[PDB]
Amino acid sequence: AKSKNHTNHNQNRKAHKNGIKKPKKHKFMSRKGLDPNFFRNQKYCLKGIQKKKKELKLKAKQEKNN
Amino acid sequence: AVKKVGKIIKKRTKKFTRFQSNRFMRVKPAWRKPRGIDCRVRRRYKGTNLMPSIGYGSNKKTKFLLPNNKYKYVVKNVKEMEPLIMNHTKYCVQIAHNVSSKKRKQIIERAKQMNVSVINAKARL
RNA sequence: AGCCAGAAACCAUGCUGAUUAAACAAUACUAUCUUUUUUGUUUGCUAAUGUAAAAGAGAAAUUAUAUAUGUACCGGUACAUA
RNA sequence: GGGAUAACUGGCUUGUGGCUGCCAAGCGCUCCUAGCGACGUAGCUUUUUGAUCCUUCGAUGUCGGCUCUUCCUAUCAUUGGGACGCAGAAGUCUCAAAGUGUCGGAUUGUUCACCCGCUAAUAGGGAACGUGAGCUGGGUUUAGACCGUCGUGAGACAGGUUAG
RNA sequence: UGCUAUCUAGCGAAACCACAGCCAAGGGAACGGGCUUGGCAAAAUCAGCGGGGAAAGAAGACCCUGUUGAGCUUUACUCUAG
RNA sequence: UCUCAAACUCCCAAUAGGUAAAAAGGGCGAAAUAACUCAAUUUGUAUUUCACUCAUAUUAAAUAAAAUAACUCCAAGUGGGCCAUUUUUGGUAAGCAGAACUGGCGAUGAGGGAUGCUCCUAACGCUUGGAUAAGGUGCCUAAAUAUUCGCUCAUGAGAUCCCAUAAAAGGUGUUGGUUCAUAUGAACUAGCCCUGAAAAUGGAUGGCGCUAAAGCGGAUUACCGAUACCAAGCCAUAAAAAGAAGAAAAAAUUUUUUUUUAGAAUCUUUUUAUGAGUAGAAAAUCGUGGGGUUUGUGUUGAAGCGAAAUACGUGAGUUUUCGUGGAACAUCUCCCUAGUGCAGAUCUUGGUGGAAGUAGCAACUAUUCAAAUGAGAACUUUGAAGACUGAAGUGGAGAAGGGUUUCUU
RNA sequence: AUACUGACGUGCAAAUCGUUCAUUUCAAUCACGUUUAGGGGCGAAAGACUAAUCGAAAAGCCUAUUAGCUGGUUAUUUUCGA
RNA sequence: UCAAUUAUUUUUUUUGCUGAGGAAUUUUAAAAUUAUUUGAAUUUUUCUUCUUAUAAUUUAAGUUGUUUCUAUACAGUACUUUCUUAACCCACUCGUCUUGAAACACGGACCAAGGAGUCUAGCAAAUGUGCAAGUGUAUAUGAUUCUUUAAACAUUUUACGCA
RNA sequence: UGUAGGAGACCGAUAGCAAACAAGUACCGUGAGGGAAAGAUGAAAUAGUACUCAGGAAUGAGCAAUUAAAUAGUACCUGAAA
């Protein structure tokens, strides 16, 4: 029964009451969707680097104890 | 208007008696805050019965003080003398509603020993 | 600018009202009383008080306004004076 | 439940209606304008009809007539005039004017309309669409009933009729 | 003309009632008894009367609305007595 | 070549929009890792470890009561809005319907706009003073019958946005201009004014009034003018400081006498800022019934109630006096509990008013005189009159129904 | 119980009263007793009537039925606030 | 005569309003000013400047002083303060739903008393509290438990809920 | 539910059972049914208004009189507001 249709009125003013919130801008981002093959090689590289670090850490610690 | 006595300034003498209390006979004179719409009180039209306001509140040095210059302490037993002696220079005795004449007289005598006047001293005589 | 006559219109006149004017004038008779002076007016009552304005509550030409008033002559003319 | 929403007033507007203009091609023998006045174009008003849905639905009694008074003028007549296509008699356009007047019937539910007749002329409007604790109740419009059309039907109809 | 009304003596209610009670215009929820500005405005009453109180009444019977109904009908849906 | 387009486009704004201005990072180097990568294990890619080093010792452009920022949780109210400027669509238009941006109102006082929810000024604790704003300054009505230059007379003039009418068109009213001609004749032009310009209670520049304005158009000041603005005090809220023990004065006659002498964290001292508000949320309070607890009040009259109080509290309230009154009353010491706070509901219930000594006591023809009774007689009784019912009777009888209403005293 | 749309319309009365009018030997009127009961009766049909009750009586209960709708919804100050 | 208008400055005549505070070490320190003292300066000084040493003081470092009066009172006609009309200026029926009510919107003659977010179930977050890889002690048993006891107390090592 | 005990962080006469009481009564309804209003003098009435006067009487007043108390007199506690 005979309604009014629309208005954008006050909505912008309401938005400015708490301001328009913006990105948190993280340095790391979850990478599920990113380039297969290249990213699984990156996973192998990363695992490789971790293994390299582990080998270095274990040998150095064992050397220090002796 | 404003009522200075020494460094005791009291802002308002006239009590904030309730909106149009004589107009509707059922109304009593003690304050009640309208939750009404267009009440001519909260909707703050000048020339009506004034709202009470915290701004009218007493200065912190005075707070509850009397023109007597001593804070009133109400007394219904003789034993109440014992703190009142140490505070006599800052506090005054008022004798309570109930107090039987024999006891009341004894308290009045005690108050004189304490060197503090009773503000309702002539009562029950 | 200055004027004139001119309508069933207009305003008086006329006529009606006028405790519409909290209106008023003249006249007639009357109420222990009026008039002058002194002191008082810090069971409902039985002496008795009120002022919107004292402070020197001071002041009577007049048409005037692109001119007035006297005085002298015959509403005018002449002469003074603000 | 609803003035969140019609029918009644009021209100805004004035398309539509009504009234007043401006003009100058013609008409008016002859002659633009005595009288006219198109094709055009400007206003005013709300006695029209609308558009509307702000106001009122725990109610502003829903038409008309009768009766009764007052206001308006955009004057029909009476008073004074101006112009004329005016010889007089008339008559016609026009202005100041709202002091005064503006009727009897026939037919209607009727504003309106339409005859017949008088008149001196029988102008136009406002007042909560003047006027229902003034009246009336004929009509739209409660519940009964009738005919036509429409609806299979029950029923429906700003279709008509009688009783309330 | 009767009977009433009227006036007295006697007995003696009710509906109604925000507060009330002179206008005019304005603005305003767009028609005010109160508001703003104007007009104004002087007790108390008796008898009437119907202009107003958008007078009194009854939760608009009209209209619209409700995922409230009820009544009725059919070749609406689902049944069912017969 | 003339004129053109929302749904045409060669070109093409303002406004609005986005990215940018370095340290969890960026430079240039080395070394590592791969199952990615190329002919090619440094051929790159990307990552990792080590290096060397980029402004910030005024900050790689400003400016910032920039953390009052984030973020999580839990929830409310709301979902019918409206008004204004500017852009704007439909519709003849509309205080009409529909949009856009922003600001208002809603939810808002205050001062002006004569009045007025919205226009303008401006957002508000309580006060004192100042100086201003919007706006005014003839009087109502506070300040100028101010100054200063023009224009303006109207036999319905005109006078502050919204705002309450007004146009095309005329004018030998007056005022300036400007083009022409020969201090004159033309033609135009816009200022004021006039005509164009009619309505409904009596009638509206707000009214009175105003014309050497108190009109219209300027300018020049002064004065007046708000709860806005500045300074000051006080209150509360918000934030910030800071904090877990020692002699001052007066009176006397060196000593006597008089006053004071703070350390309780939701606390005390201090400072600055802030103070709108419906729907709504929170906290702090105040009161009522009962319970435990604590330590009191009672018949040398309490509670209760009416009237009050130089009373206290912003306030709800609290406290108290007098009068009435005659029996039970508190707890704020702490804490539990609840049939816990009223002006309103055509509230429920009870009482009561104004309306009002009014409406009214109008069917049915009529009573009078005298006497008696009694306190008292229009309407009791007795008598006399007058009248009426008028055999379908206010007459007799019976049924229903009632039930001692009968009858005497 | 036709009309005066009479009087009355806070009544004499929640339908009376006055005058007018229809009926009056039959499908007549009256009494008493009796029958038929609630989605049922009964109806010379008007949805009429069935105890001031009817397009579904009265009584009691399921029931405090249900209601997106109407009305009302109770001391104080302070803070943030659509 | 030596304007005027800017610039930096220096005064002055009357006068209005205000007085918070209260300094056991920020009413302290320096400054200022005065009387001293030493060294300099320069526009050269009877308010010339700095710093060297000493004192006082205030312009520092939020009112103090003097004189009246109340009054030589005991409540008075004064003073305090309540009530009461006045008078100037301002002031529209409250509640209510509605964007919007002083309304020609709705409810309300008046006064008194009574009169409306509760209780149970289950759940959630919050905050407190006790314990922690456990927790609760369920039904129930037990007791030298018997007005108040209808609670309180206890529970001779794989029960159950939830984790 | 009937009867008997014992209870209470229950109500305190508009509440609590409809019923503190001569209430399941009065009263209303044709009937089924519906269904109230309604407590308090004082310690003691074996203290309940004696007596007098004026009154036709009701009543009133008293120098008279009970009580601690009669604006405590049986429509008797207190006695608010309108």
Q: How many CA atoms lie within 13 A of B74 on its CB side?
A: 4
Measured CA to CA, the distance from residue A51 to residue A45 in angstroms comes to 10
| Torsion B67-B71-B77-B81 (CA) sign | negative
8 Å CB contact between B46 and B39: no
The DSSP code for A16 is T
Measured CA to CA, the distance from residue B120 to residue B102 in angstroms comes to 16
Nearest-CA neighbor of B95 among B65, B78, B118? B118
**Å between CA of B39 and C1' of F130:** 36
The pair of structure tokens assigned to A22 is 């913006």
Q: Which of residues 5-24 of B touch strand F (CB under 7 A)?
A: 9-12, 15-16, 18-19, 24
Q: Which of residues 75-114 of B touch strand F (CB under 7 A)?
A: 76-79, 88-89, 94-104
Q: Which experiment gave this structure?
A: cryo-EM
CB under 8 Å to B50, separation ≥6 — which residues? B16
Q: Resolution limit in angstroms?
A: 4.7
Measured CA to CA, the distance from residue B51 to residue B30 in angstroms comes to 12
